[PDB]
């Protein structure tokens, strides 16, 4: 049986909120809740008297309670038994001390492959209240605007980038996910492309019998590291709100290796307490700051 997750007591002197600018987080949530940084001190399991201090992120639910990301409040991992990797489309959520439930991306495990899940600078998921209302979220370290793609060669963002993503909804006490199967060959997957020349985002989060109807981006504008606009699913219009995540990557000398915005996430909101509401997150599969396209067609290098 899945264990009940207890809240973290952040009033402990060993758990200290991190107010540094470097660790500031941003969350998109449908009905409250956010990811928040802490410095946490814990006794060593191995060395007497030794205290171990590390940076952590906790999820603060809409009720104010804090939860860690751990082993039982994540998506089911795909099987490792063949080359094939299939993400199951339905997942149990972990019950909470409050009577709510929680789930977040299974970021942590190796040889899953499945690049959308390999998030390093964000998380996405959902919290359910004891009353069965849900707040879906995507939050993380925002992509600094000064190191977005193209800024180093033009002074502003330019070109295009394509992201490999997963969508999450909550249906009937379970988390349900968009179709994803890999074998960088992808049998089924969901892709979003940002055109920084035109400031547009396009793409489709692919549905199935569990997730429900696909979510098609319709008119989404991109301003700096944030975006917003409309999407459709089954005839219903939802409001898209999201952003680009992850700092830039540098070579040892300080030279830019990859721009900021290597991850992406957000929410799609079809109405207060709508079961269609979604969060999503994923990773940058490809980018080209020099692309002069004016459309949101995907980049498709092998």
Numbering used by the authors: 15 to 197, 204 to 322
How do the authors describe this structure?
Residues from 15 to 197 and 204 to 322 are visible in the electron density. The structure reveals a single domain composed of a small compact C-terminal β-barrel (residues 157–322) and a more open N-terminal β-sandwich (residues 1–156). Prominent features of the structure include two long extensions from the core of the protein, one formed from two longer strands of the N-terminal β-sandwich (β3 and β4) (loop-1) and the second from a loop at one end of the C-terminal β-barrel, between strands β20 and β23 (loop-5). Both loops present hydrophobic side chains at their distal end including those of Tyr-60, Phe-271 and Tyr-272. Two shorter loops on the same side of the protein comprise residues 92–100 (loop-2) and 122–127 (loop-3). The B-factors of Gln-123 to Thr-126 of KdHpuA in the unliganded structure are higher than for any other amino acid; further suggesting this is a flexible part of the molecule. Strikingly, although the Cys–Cys motif of TbpB C-lobe has always been observed to form a disulphide bond, in our HpuA structures this motif is in reduced form despite a lack of reducing agent in the protein storage or crystallization buffers.
The Neisseriaceae family of Gram-negative bacteria express a bipartite receptor, HpuAB, to efficiently use haem extracted from Hb:Hp complexes as an iron source. HpuA is expressed outside the cell, anchored to the outer membrane by its acylated amino terminus. Although a direct interaction between HpuA on meningococci and Hb was not detected using flow cytometry, the lipoprotein is required for the high-affinity interaction between HpuB and Hb, for meningococcal survival on Hb as a sole iron source and for efficient dissociation of Hb2023. To investigate the structure and function of HpuA we crystallized the carboxy-terminal portion of the protein from N. gonorrhoeae (NgHpuA-C) and a full-length homologue from K. denitrificans (KdHpuA).
